[PDB]
From a paper:
Phosphoglycerate mutase family member 5 (PGAM5) is an atypical protein phosphatase implicated in a number of functions within mitochondria, including organelle homeostasis, mitophagy, and cell death. However, unlike most PGAM enzymes, which are phosphotransferases or phosphohydrolases of small metabolites, PGAM5 dephosphorylates protein substrates, targeting phosphorylated serine, threonine, and histidine residues. Between the MTS and phosphatase domain, PGAM5 contains a linker domain with a centrally located “multimerization motif” that potentiates PGAM5 activity.
However, a crystal structure of Δ90 PGAM5 H105A without the MM that we determined suggests otherwise. The main difference between this dimer conformation and the apo “on” state of the dodecameric ∆90 PGAM5 H105A/MM structure is a disordered β3–α3 loop in Δ90 PGAM5 H105A. Thus, in the absence of discrete phosphatase domain interactions with the β3–α3 loop, the active architecture can be achieved, at least structurally, as long as a phosphate ion is coordinated.
Residue numbers in the entry:
A (entry chain A): 88 to 181, 193 to 289
B (entry chain B): 88 to 177, 193 to 214, 220 to 289
Write the structure that this text describes.
């Protein structure tokens, strides 16, 4: 749960891990989704669209694989706006200064997108964030007040859905973590 | 990682919450699955059978709704043996002892030569406790987990006691209109 938090209605947070991609791509432009990663993103988009929810926005990491995952998912959610942010780019694997910078940035993402209540909120909101494993691990453990040793104990599949429910007073519930039950087992990967 | 733990191979633990049931049943024999609860259990059994795994055993709570959830899931898993236990069943002295029983379940089934795949069909408070205990999360954390009826929660315990949570509360294989929390 979160301290010093007061929102006007309940917020549903859907954290999506980017789909399978070309890890060995030389440049960032080369680190595109694999054919299977594209199929994974289609399955996640189908599932999100079947929920019968009006999503307020899709916020996504600016990494190539997150942009491409977002593009595919967004096809299933016509009219939902998309916002790119460098704050949700992946953090270094769990050089000291790079880790300092990543920790500060992902904390800023948590504060800006998760802990921040929108004074303009007028009804329950449903928000999609398409990003990366370490970012999602950090956000989940911070929101639930789990220790940082918890990050590596969460093992998230490509394209998986993690669903947090934030009540107006800051109580946070974990409804699902790493959900890929909507994918056939022969399409499920971790990298 | 879990302390004082040394296994010979990796253990996959699938924790299944019982399906929707008649909460207002007067006696325990009356607290049976609803028609939708039976459909949920069928969906979970279909999913478990599709994973390409040979399950070593199904351990289940002796509560009526867990027995009936197990009966349906087991139809999809021929040859997998079933074990009933009171340890997994869901004033002040009775509540303390119920809590002590859940810690005993954790010690007996979780903390205790080839990789194994084990199914445990039980209840929300038991599963949430086990998840937070295995992941070494604070004791207050359990109530922050919200599990759907018939959901699959998947823990992996490595031989050195390292634990990973692969999924929690998965009902992605159910159509949205079949999903319930009570
Ligand atoms: Na990329
Ligand atoms: Na809220
Ligand atoms: Na996962
Ligand atoms: Na029952
Ligand atoms: Na759930
Ligand atoms: Na359900």
């Amino acid at each position: 749960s979160m301290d010093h938090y007061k929102a006007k209605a309940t917020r549903h947070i859907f954290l999506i891990r980017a789909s399978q991609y070309h890890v060995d791509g030389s440049l960032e432009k080369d680190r595109t989704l694999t054919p299977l990663g594209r199929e994974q993103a289609e399955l996640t988009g189908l599932r999100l669209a079947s929920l019968g929810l009006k999503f307020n926005k899709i916020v996504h990491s600016s990494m190539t694989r997150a942009i491409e995952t977002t593009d595919i998912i967004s096809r299933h959610l016509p009219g939902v706006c998309k916002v790119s942010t460098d704050l949700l780019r992946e953090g270094a694997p769990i050089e000291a200064v790079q880790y300092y910078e990543d920790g500060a940035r992902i904390e800023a993402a948590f504060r800006n997108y998760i802990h921040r209540a929108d004074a303009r909120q007028e009804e329950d909101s449903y928000e999609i964030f398409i990003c990366h494993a370490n970012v999602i691990r950090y956000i989940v453990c911070r929101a639930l007040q789990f220790p940082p040793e918890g990050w590596l104990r969460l093992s998230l599949n490509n394209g998986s859905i993690t669903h947090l429910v934030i009540r107006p007073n800051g109580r946070v519930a974990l409804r699902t973590l790493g959900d890929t039950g909507f994918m056939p087992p022969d399409k499920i990967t971790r990298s």
